[PDB]
Amino acid sequence: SGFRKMAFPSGKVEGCMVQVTCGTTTLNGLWLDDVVYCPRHVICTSEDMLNPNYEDLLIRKSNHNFLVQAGNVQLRVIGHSMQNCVLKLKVDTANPKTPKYKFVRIQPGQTFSVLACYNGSPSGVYQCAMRPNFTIKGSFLNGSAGSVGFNIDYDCVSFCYMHHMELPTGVHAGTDLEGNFYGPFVDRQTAQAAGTDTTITVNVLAWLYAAVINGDRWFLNRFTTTLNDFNLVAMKYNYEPLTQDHVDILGPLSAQTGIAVLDMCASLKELLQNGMNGRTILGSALLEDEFTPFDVVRQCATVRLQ
Amino acid sequence: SGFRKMAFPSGKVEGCMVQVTCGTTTLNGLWLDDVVYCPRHVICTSEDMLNPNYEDLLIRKSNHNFLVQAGNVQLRVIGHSMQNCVLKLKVDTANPKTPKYKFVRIQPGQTFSVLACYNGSPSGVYQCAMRPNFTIKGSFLNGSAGSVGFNIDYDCVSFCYMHHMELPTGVHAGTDLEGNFYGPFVDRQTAQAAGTDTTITVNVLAWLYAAVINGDRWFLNRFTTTLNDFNLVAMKYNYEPLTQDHVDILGPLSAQTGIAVLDMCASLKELLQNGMNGRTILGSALLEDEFTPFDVVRQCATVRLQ
Ligand code: NA
Ligand code: NA
């Protein structure tokens, strides 16, 4: 059947993307109902990014200072609002292509689809994960601010991310659709420490469960370990600690196979201590931490009634 | 910054995805103008799949024997014709969401975006490359036939692939939108095998250039080798030879980096001889053959006006 990291079909999100222009700075905005959400720094000037006083800058701006465009049609702005680090532009027209949407804040280790846009036009879509240090290993160039991260559940598009900035390490940071930054970051061009980026342990365990189902099982031991002992070893090897919520997520895969979560944890604990030493798991010498138990269950090959 | 295997936005393709049902078997269909394209084995029963007489089966089929549904709306089939391995169903309505499009036959080593659909409804989008043996290492389940692969240039959607079946090895095969299969395969449940799967070397060279872009160069040498010598060494391993066209495609990468293409070839040549099996930490991270030079160029910052 094959395993592939998949983004959700972006057609619903592409219908809410508009161009927001302020001065000579143009970047993307999210048009839902009669509100357009965009990053704050559209109002910023070149010299005023080290420590912008956004509230003072916003007052000097007016409604006609913002140009919102959706294709050949231009949208008229009736008001501007600052919700944390996100600018809310009320327009005179509701988006007819507005889908059933809800705003969600995701936890580290979860995945979502990113629609990278430039000048208001969608350019590409990719799947990524929220790193434990609240960064994302995305692919963004200058002008990609305003791109949104999302997940589609049935018919409801659950928006969870908006891109703002790129850190010096090369990773990217942003806010939820309510303007609150993921992690201890601010939208200022000043030195900011992201913190150590640990490996998503729950996704690695799901990867190991996928390997066991597909036949890769050289790395298994009959031993079981306590959660405390595994968490101690995991942090010594820069693995994110395993919580009760992570174990609950791993429940379906552990039941589909015969391996208890702490049984698999003992296998991974000895894996970390000894290394892979020439052996490969699922065809790679490295482990995957951005493939979720959701992804494994939906894409795994099943038995065949003959 | 940041490199990610990105797929083209699937909105334009999403608007052409319909559900084609013949008897009890249901597949996906591509609705362009007043014609719906779908795999022809939709007319097959549970039997008639080991060795089908597609001409005989389709001659017995009637126009009302096909049920085409787009959302809740159901389209009437006014005509049916066979184009090689693909069924062309003329419907009573031209698709109003039809984009500017053309039918393209890709070459091995090139990439495109797959929109996986089930029951005519889009489910996920991922990027993949045509393997040297004309197979696809995709993620497909039963009922995914009719899913299409595409590339987007401006507003023109270049359809290049429609998924049909899965080989016992787990890889997938399909046809162009003209019904002609990619590879020596046929749409029959018979014993078929793909050719030797080799590494698309021009893509790994592009991957190495991206690693240089990210600031990692501790696996390069200052040596240069001729193309003929590299190809002999490369062909001894399971690597495809470099054509002059491949070098020309790699030219922009060399210009942006200052590393000669043959310089990078010698670096790869030395790595292979020293035992880069693709089974070590440095081999499994540097050996990626599904990231084209265009992807590296399209995700890089060019000359920067300061
Ligand atoms: Na164990
Ligand atoms: Na070299």
SS3 of B207-254: the string is: HHHHHHHCCCCCCCCCCCCCHHHHHHHHHHCCECCCCHHHHHHCHHHH
Of A180, A259, A258, A272, which is closest to residue A224 (Cα–Cα)? A259
Residues of B in contact with A172 (CB under 8 A): 2
- Nearest-angstrom CA–CA distance, A48 and A45: 5
Residues in a beta bridge with B89:
B36, B80
Q: Is A225 left (phi over 0), alpha (psi -120 to 50) or beta?
A: beta
DSSP-derived secondary structure for B40-64 = GGGG--SSS-SS--HHHHHHH--GG
Evaluate whether A7 touches B126 at the Cβ level (below 8 Å): yes
User: Quick check: helix, strand or coil at residue A173?
Assistant: strand
For A14, the closest of B9, B122, B172 (CB atoms) is: B9
DSSP-derived secondary structure for A246-257 = HHHHTHHHHHHS
Quick one: closest CA in B to A302, which residue? B141
- Nearest-angstrom CA–CA distance, B203 and B212: 14
Taking the CB of residue B143, how many other CB atoms lie within 10 A of it? 17
Measured between CA atoms, how close is B202 to chain A, in angstroms? 21
Dihedral angle sign, alpha carbons of residues B80, B81, B86, B90: negative
Token pair belonging to A153: 């559940």
Measured between CA atoms, how close is A16 to chain B, in angstroms? 12
Mutate to test the interface with A, among B111, B113, B126 (most CBs of A within 10 A): B126
Distance B108 CA to ligand 2 centre (A): 26
Evaluate whether A173 touches A165 at the Cβ level (below 8 Å): yes
Of B165, B209, B217, which is closest to residue B191 (Cα–Cα)? B165
Of A22, A92, A19, A21, which is closest to residue A57 (Cα–Cα)? A22
Matching residue, tokens 């365990």: A205
Q: Which long-range contacts (CB under 8 A, 24 or more apart) does A274-278 make?
A: A278/B279, A278/B280
B193-B195-B196 Cα angle (round to 5): 125
Q: Which residues of A109-128 are buried (b: 16+ CB within 10 A; e: fewer)?
A: bbbbbbbbbbebebbbbbbb
Of B38, B44, B7, which is closest to residue B177 (Cα–Cα)? B38
Go through chain A and tell me how many residues it has.
306
A138-A200-B208 Cα angle (round to 5): 45
Measured between CA atoms, how close is A152 to chain B, in angstroms? 10
Token pair belonging to A213: 């189902």
Measured between CA atoms, how close is A63 to chain B, in angstroms? 30
A280 contacts chain B (CB < 8 A): yes
DSSP-derived secondary structure for A23-44 = TTEEEEEEEETTEEEEEGGGG-
Evaluate whether B11 touches B115 at the Cβ level (below 8 Å): no
Dmax over Cα atoms in chain A, in whole Å? 73
Q: Which residues of B244-277 are buried (b: 16+ CB within 10 A; e: fewer)?
A: eebbebbeebbebbebebbbbbbbbbbbbeeebe
Evaluate whether B31 touches B12 at the Cβ level (below 8 Å): no
In angstroms, what CA-CA distances link B2 with B127, B174, B283?
A: 17, 32, 20
- Nearest-angstrom CA–CA distance, B91 and B70: 12
Of B108, B38, B40, which is closest to residue B292 (Cα–Cα)? B108
A71-B1-B284 Cα angle (round to 5): 125
Of A247, A257, A260, A253, which is closest to residue A298 (Cα–Cα)? A253
Matching residue, tokens 């787990």: B170
Residues of B in contact with A285 (CB under 8 A): 278-281, 283-284
Residue A16: HSE in the Cβ half-sphere, 13 Å Cα cutoff = 25
Dihedral angle sign, alpha carbons of residues B249, B255, B261, B266: negative
- Nearest-angstrom CA–CA distance, A178 and B207: 37
A residues 157-186 lying closer than 8 A (beta carbon) to B: 166, 170-172
Q: Which residues of A63-85 are buried (b: 16+ CB within 10 A; e: fewer)?
A: eeebbbbbeeeebebeebeeeeb
Question: Letter for the amino acid at A265?
Answer: C
Q: Is B276 left (phi over 0), alpha (psi -120 to 50) or beta?
A: beta
CB-based contact B11 A8, cutoff 8 Å = no
- Over its C-alpha atoms, chain B yields an Rg (Å, rounded) of 22
Measured between CA atoms, how close is B266 to chain A, in angstroms? 24
User: Quick check: helix, strand or coil at residue A297?
Assistant: helix
Residue A40: phi, psi to the nearest 5? -70, -35
- Nearest-angstrom CA–CA distance, A131 and A235: 15
Residues of A in contact with B8 (CB under 8 A): 124-125
CB-based contact A9 B7, cutoff 8 Å = no
Specify the pairing of strand B86-91 against strand B17-22. Answer: unpaired
Residues of B in contact with A287 (CB under 8 A): none
CB-based contact A9 B124, cutoff 8 Å = yes
CB-based contact A128 B171, cutoff 8 Å = no
In angstroms, what CA-CA distances link B223 with B201, B265, B267, B275?
A: 18, 9, 7, 18
B79 contacts chain A (CB < 8 A): no
Question: Letter for the amino acid at A277?
Answer: N
Which secondary-structure segment (H or E) carries B22? strand B17-22
In angstroms, what CA-CA distances link B65 with B21, B33, B34?
A: 8, 21, 18
CB-based contact B285 A286, cutoff 8 Å = yes
Distance B258 CA to ligand 2 centre (A): 12
3-state secondary structure B147-216: CEEEEEECCEEEEEEEEEEECCCCCEEEECCCCCECCCCCCCCCCCCCCCCCECHHHHHHHHHHHHHCCC
CB-based contact A6 B128, cutoff 8 Å = no
B296 contacts chain A (CB < 8 A): no
Q: Collect all residues with Cβ–Cβ distance below 8 Å to A255 and sequence separation of at least 6.
A: none
- Nearest-angstrom CA–CA distance, A15 and A32: 9
Distance A260 CA to ligand 1 centre (A): 8
